[PDB]
Amino acid sequence: VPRGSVPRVFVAGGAGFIGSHYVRELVAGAYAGWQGCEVTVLDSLTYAGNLANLAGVRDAVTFVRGDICDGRLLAEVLPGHDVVLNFAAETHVDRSIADSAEFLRTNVQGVQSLMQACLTAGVPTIVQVSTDEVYGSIEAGSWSEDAPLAPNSPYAAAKAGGDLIALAYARTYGLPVRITRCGNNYGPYQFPEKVIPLFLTRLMDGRSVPLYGDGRNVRDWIHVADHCRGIQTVVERGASGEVYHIAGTAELTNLELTQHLLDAVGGSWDAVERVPDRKGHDRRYSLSDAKLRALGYAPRVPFADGLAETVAWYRANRHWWEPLRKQLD
Amino acid sequence: LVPRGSVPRVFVAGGAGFIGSHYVRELVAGAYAGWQGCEVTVLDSLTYAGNLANLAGVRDAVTFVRGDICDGRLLAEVLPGHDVVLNFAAETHVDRSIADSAEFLRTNVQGVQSLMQACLTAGVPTIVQVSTDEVYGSIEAGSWSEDAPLAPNSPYAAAKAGGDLIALAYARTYGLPVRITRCGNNYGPYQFPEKVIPLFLTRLMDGRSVPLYGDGRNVRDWIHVADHCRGIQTVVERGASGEVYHIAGTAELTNLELTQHLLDAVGGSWDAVERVPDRKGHDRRYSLSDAKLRALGYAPRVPFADGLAETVAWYRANRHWWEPLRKQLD
Ligand SMILES: NC(=O)c1ccc[n+]([C@@H]2O[C@H](COP(=O)([O-])OP(=O)(O)OC[C@H]3O[C@@H](n4cnc5c(N)ncnc54)[C@H](O)[C@@H]3O)[C@@H](O)[C@H]2O)c1
Ligand SMILES: NC(=O)c1ccc[n+]([C@@H]2O[C@H](COP(=O)([O-])OP(=O)(O)OC[C@H]3O[C@@H](n4cnc5c(N)ncnc54)[C@H](O)[C@@H]3O)[C@@H](O)[C@H]2O)c1
Ligand SMILES: Cc1cn([C@H]2C[C@H](O)[C@@H](COP(=O)(O)OP(=O)(O)O)O2)c(=O)[nH]c1=O
C-alpha cells in the first residue's frame, strides 16, 4: 500500500532553491491542515541541487536521486501520493543562452514525462510551477492570466513549452494539473548565480558586482516564502486546467535593486561594474494576481524585511555558499 | 538567393514524408522559378511515416541521409554548405499523440532546438520551421491572424507549439534567420493512409468501412499539398527572419460534408460509414487568415473538387504504394 494515515506529497526538484523551501515549510507544519506529512523529494542533483538544503528534514523526507524524464522510475515512485509539485527545471537565463539543450529536455520533455506518469498513477492534485517570463516583456501595466505567450529567451520558451504540454494533458485527459506563474524569487538557499545572491556574496567578499547593460531592466521581487504560500493556495483552492499568477511586491529597476542591496550590506557604488548587456534581455515583467488573491492568497513578507533576513542568512552561511562562489569564480 | 556554390543547395529535414517529399519533388522538377538544378539533401529518420518510395522519381538529384534531427553531431557535419534548411520532420498524427506523446515532444520540440542550434553554428542563411494551425486551439467564427495567442489543446498541437516557441526564441535571442509557417489540413498523393482523406479512399476502394467520429460537426480548412508547398516556397523567397506566415485552406468543411465529398468522389455509400463515439483530442474548428502571405504573392492553384479528384485517381492507380501501408495499419 503506497499511502497511510497522513498526506503524502511528492516534490520534484525539491533539493533546489524554491522546492527545498516548500519542503522545509511543509515539514515544519507551516501550512495548516498538512501536519505530519510524508514527503518524497525526487531530484537529479544538477549543479543547482543541494542536499544541504534538506539536511534538517530528513526524518520526514524520502529522497530519490533521479530524473523527471525517467518514466519507469516515476511509475514506481508516484503511486500513493496525494499531491505532486514540479519545481524541477533548468532555471538560469544566462545558462540557457549558452546552451539550451537541457532546458528543453528538463523543462518540456520532463513535464511530459511527469504528467504522463501522474495520469497513469491517478495523482489527484498536480502543480506545474512556472514563471512570468513566458509572457515576454511589458513596458507598462501588468499581465493577467489571459496574456499571450511570447517568450524571448530559450529558458522562457522552454518553461512555456512545459506549460503548454501540461495544459494539453488537462484539456485532453482531464489531468488535474494547475499552473502557477511567479515573479523573481529571492531568499535563503538561492544558488548564487541569480542576481541577489550573486551580488550579496560578492559584496561580502569585497568583490565587484556586474550590472548588465544600462541597469534599467525591471523585475518584480517576491520572497520565496510568499511564492510557496501562493503555491499552497493553488494546491488547496485552485482548479484543474487553470493558471494562477503570484505577483511580486517590489517592482524595481536593477539600478534601484542595486541601491537596496548596497544599503543592506553597507556597500559602495564603487563596487558596481557596468558590463555588456545580456542577449535578448527582457526589459520588464509585471503580473496581476487578482485571481489568486480572490482565493485568499496575500503576501506576508515586505521587501525590506525579507531582504534584511536574506542578507543575514548569506552573512551567516559562508559554509554553504563559499564553495559555490569558488566554483563559479 | 545567392547560393554558396554553383547551384543552390537545399536541406530538407523530414523530406521522406508526405509534405516534405512533395516539396522535394517540386523543387527538383523545376516548379519554383529561380530554383533549377538545385542540389538537395534530405535527412529523414524513416519512422513509420517515412517512405523512400515518395522520392523514387528524384533519386539521382537528392542525397538521402537516414538520420534524426535530434542528432546534433550528425547535423553539425551535414548542414554546412546549405543555403536553405526546411524542417518538415515531425510526429504528425493527433490520435497517435493521444496514445503516447513522448516522441511528439522529442521530435517536435527537442528536435527543433537541435536543428536551430546546429543551424546557428553552421551559419545557414534561411531556415523554415513548418508548423500547424492547431497551435491556436479552436475558433468558432472568423479566422486567426498571425498574432493569435498560442492555445493548443492536444499533445500534438502543444508539441508543435513548443517547437515554434523555441525557434522564435532563437530568432529573438541570437537573430537566427528562422521563419515559421502554419497551415491547416493537407491532402494529396503520397499521404500516409492514417489521415482521414487517404484512410477513407483506401478503405472505400477495398470495400471496407470508414469511421466517422462523434457528431461529425468538427470543421477543417483543406489545402492541397502542392499549394502548401508553394506557400512555403513563397516564405523561402519573400519572408523575413522571426516572422510567422499563415497558409490558408480554401475548402472549409464539416466532417459530415467531408464524408459526403469522399463518398461521392469514390462512388461509395453511407452504408460504409461506421458511426463511432467521439475521440479525445480533436478541436471544433480551425481557420487561418493568410492575407499576410497573399500580400507577398502567394495564391493557391488547386480547387478542392479538382484536387480531390486527382487524389482519388492517384490512389486508384497506386495500390502498389498504399496496399502494404493499409495492410499494416489493419
Ligand atoms: N528562481 C526564480 O526566481 C523563479 C521564478 C519563477 C519561477 N521559477 C520556477 O520555479 C522552479 C524552481 O526554481 P528554483 O529557483 O528553485 O530552481 P533551482 O535552479 O534553484 O533548482 C532546480 C532544481 O531542479 C533539479 N533538477 C533540474 N533538472 C532536473 C531533472 N531533469 N530531474 C530532476 N530534478 C531536476 C535541480 O537538481 C535543482 O535542485 C523552477 O520550475 C523555475 O522555473 C523560479
Ligand atoms: N499533414 C498535414 O495536414 C499538416 C498540416 C499542417 C502542418 N503539417 C506539418 O507539416 C510537417 C510535415 O507533415 P507531414 O504530413 O508530411 O508528416 P508525415 O507524418 O507524413 O511525415 C513526417 C516525416 O518526418 C520523419 N521524421 C519524424 N521524426 C523525425 C526525426 N526526429 N528526425 C528526422 N525525421 C523525422 C518521418 O520519417 C517522416 O518522413 C510536419 O511538421 C507537420 O506537423 C502537416
Ligand atoms: C545574474 C545577474 C543578473 N542581472 C540582471 C538580469 C535581470 O534583469 C535581473 C535578474 O536576473 P536573474 O537573477 O538572472 O533572473 P531572471 O533572468 O529570471 O530575471 O538582474 C544582472 O544585471 N547581473 C547579474 O549578474
Residue numbers in the entry:
A (entry chain A): -4 to 324
B (entry chain B): -5 to 324
Published text:
Herein we identify a new glucuronic acid decarboxylase from Micromonospora belonging to the superfamily of short-chain dehydrogenase/reductase enzymes, EvdS6. Biochemical characterization demonstrated that EvdS6 is an NAD+-dependent bifunctional enzyme that produces a mixture of two products, differing in the sugar C-4 oxidation state. In line with the SDR architecture, each protomer consists of two domains: the N-terminal domain consisting of residues V1-Y181 and V219-A242 and the C-terminal domain between residues G182-H218 and G243-L323.
Surprisingly, the electron density at the active site of the first protomer is clearly consistent with TDP rather than UDP, but no density for the glucuronic acid was observed. In the second molecule of the dimer, electron density suggested that the different EvdS6 molecules in the crystal were bound to different species, resulting in a mixed state. Although the density was not readily interpretable, it appears that about 40 to 50% of the molecules in the crystal are likely bound to citrate from the buffer. In terms of the nucleotide diphosphate-binding residues, the TDP binds at the interdomain interface of EvdS6 and has multiple direct interactions with residues of both the N-terminal domain (E128 and N179), and the C-terminal domain (V190, P205, Y207, R214, N249, R273, and H276). In the ligand-free structure, no traceable electron density for residues R273, K274, or G275 or the sidechain of H276 was observed in one of the subunits. The change from disordered to directly interacting with the TDP suggests that this flexible loop could be involved in binding and coordinating the substrate in the active site.
